[PDB]
Scaffold this active site. Sequence first.
Site, PDB file in Angstrom:
ATOM      1  N   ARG B  78       0.826  -1.197   0.000  1.00  0.00           N
ATOM      2  CA  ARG B  78       0.000   0.000   0.000  1.00  0.00           C
ATOM      3  C   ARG B  78       0.864   1.253   0.000  1.00  0.00           C
ATOM      4  O   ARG B  78       1.708   1.450   0.891  1.00  0.00           O
ATOM      5  CB  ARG B  78      -0.901   0.045   1.228  1.00  0.00           C
ATOM      6  CG  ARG B  78      -2.158  -0.813   1.189  1.00  0.00           C
ATOM      7  CD  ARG B  78      -3.071  -0.454   2.369  1.00  0.00           C
ATOM      8  NE  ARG B  78      -4.361  -1.144   2.351  1.00  0.00           N
ATOM      9  CZ  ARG B  78      -5.452  -0.710   1.717  1.00  0.00           C
ATOM     10  NH1 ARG B  78      -5.446   0.430   1.042  1.00  0.00           N
ATOM     11  NH2 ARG B  78      -6.568  -1.428   1.767  1.00  0.00           N
ATOM     12  N   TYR B  89       2.156  12.033   2.499  1.00  0.00           N
ATOM     13  CA  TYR B  89       1.694  12.527   3.802  1.00  0.00           C
ATOM     14  C   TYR B  89       2.252  13.918   4.054  1.00  0.00           C
ATOM     15  O   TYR B  89       3.414  14.185   3.761  1.00  0.00           O
ATOM     16  CB  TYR B  89       2.154  11.578   4.922  1.00  0.00           C
ATOM     17  CG  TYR B  89       1.302  10.329   5.052  1.00  0.00           C
ATOM     18  CD1 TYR B  89       1.391   9.321   4.117  1.00  0.00           C
ATOM     19  CD2 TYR B  89       0.418  10.172   6.120  1.00  0.00           C
ATOM     20  CE1 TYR B  89       0.633   8.161   4.230  1.00  0.00           C
ATOM     21  CE2 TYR B  89      -0.356   9.014   6.227  1.00  0.00           C
ATOM     22  CZ  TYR B  89      -0.238   8.030   5.270  1.00  0.00           C
ATOM     23  OH  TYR B  89      -0.996   6.865   5.356  1.00  0.00           O
ATOM     24  N   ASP B 115     -11.323   2.163  16.196  1.00  0.00           N
ATOM     25  CA  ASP B 115     -10.691   1.601  14.999  1.00  0.00           C
ATOM     26  C   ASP B 115      -9.692   0.458  15.221  1.00  0.00           C
ATOM     27  O   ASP B 115      -9.057   0.008  14.274  1.00  0.00           O
ATOM     28  CB  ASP B 115     -10.076   2.726  14.135  1.00  0.00           C
ATOM     29  CG  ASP B 115      -8.873   3.404  14.789  1.00  0.00           C
ATOM     30  OD1 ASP B 115      -8.385   2.927  15.818  1.00  0.00           O
ATOM     31  OD2 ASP B 115      -8.427   4.463  14.279  1.00  0.00           O
ATOM     32  N   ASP B 120      -3.758   7.838  16.476  1.00  0.00           N
ATOM     33  CA  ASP B 120      -2.896   8.413  15.453  1.00  0.00           C
ATOM     34  C   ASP B 120      -2.375   9.789  15.867  1.00  0.00           C
ATOM     35  O   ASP B 120      -3.083  10.567  16.523  1.00  0.00           O
ATOM     36  CB  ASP B 120      -3.678   8.554  14.152  1.00  0.00           C
ATOM     37  CG  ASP B 120      -4.148   7.219  13.598  1.00  0.00           C
ATOM     38  OD1 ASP B 120      -3.368   6.247  13.657  1.00  0.00           O
ATOM     39  OD2 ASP B 120      -5.293   7.141  13.083  1.00  0.00           O
TER      40      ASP B 120
HETATM   41 MG    MG Z   1      -2.743   4.508  12.878  1.00  0.00          MG
HETATM   42 MG    MG Z   2      -7.997  -1.053  10.616  1.00  0.00          MG
END
Ligand code: MG
Ligand code: MG
Lengths: 278, 283
Positions: B78, B89, B115, B120
């Site tokens: 990915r 990013y 999640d 994050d």
């Molecule tokens: Mg993350």
């Molecule tokens: Mg996930």
Amino acid sequence: TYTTRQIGAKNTLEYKVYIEKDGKPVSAFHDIPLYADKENNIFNMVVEIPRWTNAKLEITKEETLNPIIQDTKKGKLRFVRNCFPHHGYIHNYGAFPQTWEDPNETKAVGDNDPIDVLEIGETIAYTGQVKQVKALGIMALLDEGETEWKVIAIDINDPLAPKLNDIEDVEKYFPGLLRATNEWFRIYKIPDGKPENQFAFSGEAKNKKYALDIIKETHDSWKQLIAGKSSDSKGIDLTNVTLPDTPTYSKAASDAIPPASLKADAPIDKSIDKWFFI
Amino acid sequence: TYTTRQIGAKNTLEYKVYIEKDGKPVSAFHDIPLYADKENNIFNMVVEIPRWTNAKLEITKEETLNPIIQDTKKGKLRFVRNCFPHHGYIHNYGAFPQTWEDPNVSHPETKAVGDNDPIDVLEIGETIAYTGQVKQVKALGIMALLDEGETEWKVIAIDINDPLAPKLNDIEDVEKYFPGLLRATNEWFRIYKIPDGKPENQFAFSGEAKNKKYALDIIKETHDSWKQLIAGKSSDSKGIDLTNVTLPDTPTYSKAASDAIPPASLKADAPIDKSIDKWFFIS
Ligand SMILES: [Mg+2]
Ligand SMILES: [Mg+2]
Ligand SMILES: [Mg+2]
């Protein structure tokens, strides 16, 4: 077949990139034909600076066979700073060989350099690449009392090239790129403590027809330069290895270039990472 | 001192980066303390993705000691695509260790679903980070992204070593010194998967970034969830590998797990397909 010969490590004072034709160095300024296909307006572009890089690499007017070297300011390597939201150069950036803005609508003199080319395709180019491009339009930047023409072009090998013929097609398939181009060339020297630049035509990109006319004019100026018929040859090295009817033809020049001595890229000071909000 | 142990070539399926302390691997998820200085709310951030890169490198929940590995899509590496005017990013991107957005908790009023990952972190400083870097950061604020039914909190942070760190204390300071960055951040997370054939994402709060006070409470909640997880007390730990080398009161403590990790075998970066150069114009 065009290839490159690298001397030294990238990001150093000693770095040079020569263009080779079938293994032999030639002048990146004088020996690469402007036209790849004159009848269809396909041009050869010499790439200096890959998209999203910072080092200010340029065809060197003052050195024999005009290798691409990093520009310097009072002995220091020049890098463009990152100007938010942009990262380095936002185009594959370079020049058309066999063009020259003679310094003798925009009311500003020629900048003494080959005409600049902004290549807008998807693939990131390499320094010293000769690629074939179509002209889409042109902008006139005013920087320190000089006109710097910026041709907007695309690699004919780009997947979108067949759909791009004139400047309006850039607005359609690359929306915002012309705005970003306007902004970038206005502000890119501000982090260096230089003034904001300005565009002629209120920042308008003129169309392909206009672009072709300017390209032709600057090619004609170059023809006078290389024939030794210009008023001021400005310490431009006119040595060339493919134009025998010129006073500065020198077959020997190719063999005088040292062999490739390609080293790993030298590190770049971490300060070049910085994003400026200006 | 935290260092990195690289296995393989970057941009390949074999690439792994373990975080080391004292030259020995530790869990990047469990063994790096959330706080570098709890009293002053200075956090340890694990950097996964340097600014202006594309490879979607992540702490791997399911692998022992949770090395950073490139994520895959049906087994294919990915890479996030370039979305005009952005390049890869636009932050140094990573996570806080010892946090977990618990996906098992019911939030019936908000309908929010965690999640399943560490929270994050977007680190906004000038210097480009490296994968596996542990840097010390101040939290400035937080945003809540909704992506395919999952809530992804994004903490806005700055490296305490950044020249501007002393002047950045709450979310409003980000707009003062990085004008336009938060607006661009909103756009980036909305659009970044469109080139992958996914929908535009949405933010809660119409994209507003909540302040430091709000952020700390969310971070605390995710640390509390992680404490339950690492104790073996989650109702569903989702095949997460809980092996750790620094938490003796946990059932999955094992100092010797570190010794089982192979030695560094760093190879030069593998080439990335030229397609990843492409700039997408979402308009
Ligand atoms: Mg993350
Ligand atoms: Mg996930
Ligand atoms: Mg130029």
